[PDB]
Design a protein around this ligand. Structure first.
Ligand SMILES: [Cu+2]
Ligand SMILES: [Cu+2]
Length: 601
């Protein structure tokens, strides 16, 4: 196909690779558009064992207008963090990792770390090599290769006796036979074969997935605010819980909820959630437990409750926190939302609050089966949360089952859905080089230009102020279709220019940056004011692991008079979260202006 011709671009847009000078390359795993118009690109150690060992941590700031890039000193391994924009435009970033060593054993046999629990405070227990552990739910058996000493449970005192904290002993376990049939994909509690009586009651294992991509993966408590003006990470109070892969999401009071993650020995945080108050720069536990898998897609609804779409990055059990629903964080009540197709393929799915955000329609896109499953979903599922009895209904389908699809809201109310892979971490060279625009008004997909670079695990996408989009990342497990050689992280970046920039001249817009309060108005200059049909306030993305709880596009009422455009911000802090937004105006041809920045107090 002649993809650079004017007619083709007018219908399909165009992709371009940017490669950075080698000095500035990194394995970008998170990115966020900052209110300065620059993009924060966070690698941390970049899922690179050498960098993890050396404590080599990387961040960049990229100026898309100037093309320039700089390094930012990175104080901790911010790979594996959660992050969201605060009301002042700083990016709260919390959690991370201190380890993800590849585990040694037979590469053809499922395995990983078993955390053995000893509830007996009176004695330790040693389990010899060749101890068999059987998943109480999964029915699968794994064998240790070395002995493990599990310490006595530690008595905890006020000095009155409270309880016993179980002794914990980690040990590598492996399937007896080769092959994927012996893998697990979710946490289970494991029976230790050969114990009886008290030892049986008191000794059991907990393990996350025991499969072929084997890692010892541990969280940290660190938290920072990234200040986009200073261009630096500012240390704030650490979280109470160590968390690799938490979601951070803004509540109706403007405080930030931190949910889930793996703890400091690789166990799922057991529903112990916490709230950051930006006014105190401190964290407080919520009162009651509510457990989810990692990177749960959690969005603030107009009634102040949190919508969990079901999309997540995995870990934890298959039967807690896996159903979509509406969570009242203050009461802790959770009400499941029915109707999700491919409810067994929600790991690595994307979630978008469709434009306009007023409508409270959420779309879940693609996904795959738990852990290293070969299952992948071609479906979209849409829930309308304004309904009295909300439910998911299928939307338009993709051509192929797709893990890891990128999904970015555009200023014309389309959603760009691109990339992903048909299988786990792109294995079998399964990157899908396809892009589509979802049109909420027709409920259909329109195929657009194919991306140039494949993007699976550890990818993402960011809408820029000029209306183009940046795509980053991709961490294939293997380099080849045969799955014999290790993959190399994708360091190339792409810019996608949508069809709307291959049309007539775009509307002009000036008068930013401005502060405009909810329920208030601001006036801008546009010579093309009388052509404007839509005004959108779009929250900048913070994207990682197929998860972006920041992006949303809010419709604004407006009036044009001559070259003056007056816009009014909607009421409701649950809708228009405080913070910085891109304001785009779009004409009757569907062509957007470049954005002006608007701060909502
Ligand atoms: Cu290491
Ligand atoms: Cu990751």
């Amino acid at each position: 196909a002649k993809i650079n011709q004017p007619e083709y671009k007018a219908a399909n847009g165009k992709w371009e690779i940017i490669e950075f000078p080698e000095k500035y390359r990194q394995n970008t795993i998170h990115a966020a558009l900052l209110r300065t118009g620059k993009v924060l690109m966070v690698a941390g150690s970049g899922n690179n064992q050498d960098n993890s060992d050396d404590k080599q941590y990387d961040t960049r700031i990229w100026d898309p207008v100037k093309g320039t890039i700089k390094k930012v000193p990175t104080p901790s391994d911010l790979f594996c963090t959660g992050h969201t924009q605060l009301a002042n435009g700083n990016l709260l970033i919390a959690g991370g990792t201190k380890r993800y060593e590849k585990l040694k054993g037979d590469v053809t046999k499922a395995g990983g770390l078993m955390v053995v629990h000893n509830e007996n405070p009176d004695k330790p227990i040693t389990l010899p090599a060749g101890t068999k552990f059987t998943g109480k739910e999964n029915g699968k058996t794994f064998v240790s290769k070395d002995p493990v000493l599990v310490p006595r449970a530690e008595k905890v005192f006020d000095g009155a006796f409270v309880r016993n904290d179980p002794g914990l002993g980690r040990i590598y376990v492996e399937a007896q036979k080769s092959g994927s049939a012996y893998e697990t994909g979710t946490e289970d509690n494991y029976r230790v074969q050969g114990l009886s009586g008290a030892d049986a009651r008191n000794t059991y294992g907990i393990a996350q997935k025991l499969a072929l991509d084997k890692k010892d993966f541990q969280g940290i408590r660190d938290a920072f605010e990234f200040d986009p003006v200073a261009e630096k990470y500012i240390k704030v109070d650490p979280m109470h819980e160590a968390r690799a892969y938490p979601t951070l999401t803004t509540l109706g009071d403007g405080k930030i909820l931190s949910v889930s993650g793996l703890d400091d020995i690789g166990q799922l945080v057991p529903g112990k959630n916490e709230v950051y108050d930006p006014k105190t720069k401190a964290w407080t536990y919520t009162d009651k437990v509510r457990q989810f898998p990692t990177y749960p897609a959690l969005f603030l609804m107009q009634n102040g409750k949190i919508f969990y779409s079901g999309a997540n990055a995995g870990y934890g059990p298959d039967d807690v926190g896996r159903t979509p629903g509406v969570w009242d964080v203050e009461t802790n009540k959770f009400t499941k939302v029915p109707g999700m197709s491919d409810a067994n393929m929600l790991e690595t799915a994307n979630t978008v609050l469709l434009p306009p955000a007023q409508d409270e329609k959420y779309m879940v896109i693609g996904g795959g089966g738990v852990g290293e499953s070969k299952l992948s979903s071609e479906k979209t599922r849409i829930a309308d949360l304004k309904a009295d009895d909300p439910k998911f209904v299928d939307g338009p389908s993709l051509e192929k089952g797709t893990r890891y699809p990128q999904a970015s809201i555009l200023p014309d109310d389309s959603v760009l859905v691109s990339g992903g892979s048909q299988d786990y971490r792109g294995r079998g060279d399964s990157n899908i080089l396809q892009a589509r625009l979802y049109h909420p008004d027709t409920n259909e997909f329109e195929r657009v230009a194919d991306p140039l670079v494949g993007r699976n695990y550890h990818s993402g996408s960011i809408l820029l102020p000029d209306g183009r989009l940046m795509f980053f990342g991709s961490d294939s497990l293997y380099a080849d279709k045969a799955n014999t050689k290790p993959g190399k992280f994708e360091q190339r970046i792409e810019i996608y220019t949508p069809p709307y920039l291959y049309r007539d001249s775009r509307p002009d817009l000036s008068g930013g940056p401005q502060t405009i309060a909810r329920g208030g108005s601001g006036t801008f200059t546009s010579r093309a004011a009388s052509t404007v049909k839509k005004v959108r306030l779009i929250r900048p993305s913070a994207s990682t692991h197929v998860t972006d709880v920041d992006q949303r596009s809010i419709a604004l009422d407006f009036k044009a008079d001559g070259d003056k455009l007056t816009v009014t911000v909607p009421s409701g802090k649950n809708l228009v979260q405080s913070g910085w937004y891109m304001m785009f105006v779009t004409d009757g041809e569907g062509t957007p202006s470049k954005a002006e920045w608007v701060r909502v107090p």
